[PDB]
Amino acid sequence: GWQFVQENGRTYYKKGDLKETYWRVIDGKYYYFDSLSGEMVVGWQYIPFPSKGSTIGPYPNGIRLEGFPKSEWYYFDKNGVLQEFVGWKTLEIKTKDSVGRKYGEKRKRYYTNYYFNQNHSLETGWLYDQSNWYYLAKTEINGENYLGGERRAGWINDDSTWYYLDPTTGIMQTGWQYLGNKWYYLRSSGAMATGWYQEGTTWYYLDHPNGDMKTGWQNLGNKWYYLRSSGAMATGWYQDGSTWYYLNAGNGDMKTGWFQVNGNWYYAYSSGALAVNTTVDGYSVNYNGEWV
Amino acid sequence: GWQFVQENGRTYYKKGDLKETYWRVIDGKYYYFDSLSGEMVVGWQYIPFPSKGSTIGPYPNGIRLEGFPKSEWYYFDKNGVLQEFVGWKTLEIKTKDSVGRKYGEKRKRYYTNYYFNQNHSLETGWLYDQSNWYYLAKTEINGENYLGGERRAGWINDDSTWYYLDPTTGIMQTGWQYLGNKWYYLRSSGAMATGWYQEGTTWYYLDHPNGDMKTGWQNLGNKWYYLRSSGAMATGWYQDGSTWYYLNAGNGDMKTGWFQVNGNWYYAYSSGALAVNTTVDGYSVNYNGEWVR
Ligand SMILES: C[N+](C)(C)CCO
Ligand SMILES: C[N+](C)(C)CCO
Ligand SMILES: C[N+](C)(C)CCO
Ligand SMILES: C[N+](C)(C)CCO
Ligand SMILES: C[N+](C)(C)CCO
Ligand SMILES: C[N+](C)(C)CCO
């Protein structure tokens, strides 16, 4: 008869000398035994999902499968029972000490949030739940890292695109966000915008690649723009000190040389500053920079 | 005839209505005038190089050749004279206020190090000089950025590889370096190593991609290794307190299950701990963990 056997501090499932390895259902509960030694596993594990005839029985004699199940993160209690969790869970963090351990091995505790799918393994990557997006860490097991599933907070970079997850809820943010004394615009997909952004009729410039909203004079594509303190791109006449500048009515680019506004001709030097009360090119201009 | 003319504080170079634009040699010295307005430039400028028939004369029959010369960083004196610098120079930092100004425009100065090539523009990127490598800032003019040429210091990422430049001198460092409480190995080309690195017979492991040297137990490439406190990879029998582990003699990877060393069989549990004075899968092992046949 199949039975649990305690040997050398470890637990095995044996019938005679015959050892179970991989998954087995025992009294309706799921257990898992190390592929090589049969040692029963406890706590966090990154192991093959149960797949008939390779990682869970029956193993009918004869013809072999090629291939092998992908691994997933599962959580087993201190006695080896697979915890069949489904929602959000608060559980211990995954470290060298808390991952891949066997019953009877010699073990401050920290916690975070994880989300279990219907098959009782961890979700990783983007998750839509209760009308919001969340980001759960991608699995990376290397060196001292045992990452995978942890609900993330703050900035994340997915496929070279930046997203912000609220640190308190894990919820992916959209819209204008104020962070580290600066403004960012997250598109309705959550994606951090860079470059020119139009909201209603107002234009904004978000740093490429940093995303932060620019204010003041910006040289962009070899043109000068003035962005107001609010980030809004200025158009028309703008007075900086006692100096006047003209920014193109539609596009916002600063004019230099001779230009006409309301059937008047004005002249701006290379700096963009309006020539006033003087002569330029033989043409007098008045106190309003009108050609007179 | 051709002459400098002042109006509205600005300087132009004109013959009647005709205004010089771009580059011109005047009494053996080089000046440059804004392409649109003819205003003479001063200070730092990022502008096309003098290319005969395009941006410097002669222009036979007034014709300008097609296309447009590559732009470079030049330094003009306050009187418009191009400063024909070569080699290292300490000059004001490049900002909004200090780049692209024209003679007659109204502007604690901050200074930094630059290197001029033989054609009197800034060198950017890798420079070998005085038997050392230096990294000069790549050109990036956009928004508020007017970068290019500045001698860089500290960690820099160039084309996917990290290099470290001394903070005081800018000299590219090589070899083992203890920086911010971690060891890094910089290869003889200066490139920061990641992954396994062998010096002599000892192996070391440097974090990929951050470069810091690892110590302790590390799970790498689906095997366990023990890196001593010097970073050197342990091989053979290793004792931690009571527990014994066997690390593959050459490769260093920890054994589990049954293995053979010096014609004796040994067994390690899944943790790597050697089984001793016990029975394992029906086999007897002695106090040395040796299988007793
Ligand atoms: C909504 N998101 C962009 C966050 C998911 C994309 O796959
Ligand atoms: C959000 N980024 C990380 C893009 C910049 C933040 O400062
Ligand atoms: C862009 N801000 C959020 C800075 C202002 C108005 O929306
Ligand atoms: C250059 N902007 C994008 C600011 C305006 C275009 O219409
Ligand atoms: C504006 N200018 C005076 C140069 C010409 C107008 O037609
Ligand atoms: C930036 N400009 C010189 C172009 C305008 C005001 O300072």
Ligand SMILES: C[N+](C)(C)CCO
């Ligand atoms: C300079 N302008 C005449 C254009 C504006 C005066 O208020």
Ligand SMILES: C[N+](C)(C)CCO
């Ligand atoms: C610093 N080096 C030139 C030697 C390396 C790569 O460019």
Ligand SMILES: C[N+](C)(C)CCO
């Ligand atoms: C820049 N490195 C990646 C080497 C480490 C910085 O802290």
Ligand SMILES: C[N+](C)(C)CCO
């Ligand atoms: C420089 N060594 C790598 C020899 C020791 C570092 O800790």
Ligand SMILES: C[N+](C)(C)CCO
């Ligand atoms: C895995 N190591 C790189 C240390 C051993 C190879 O020979």
Ligand SMILES: C[N+](C)(C)CCO
């Ligand atoms: C090496 N041993 C015989 C001890 C193990 C066989 O499975």
Ligand SMILES: C[N+](C)(C)CCO
């Ligand atoms: C060999 N291991 C890392 C698995 C044991 C450390 O204590």
Ligand SMILES: C[N+](C)(C)CCO
């Ligand atoms: C001699 N070994 C190193 C085999 C282990 C002894 O307990």
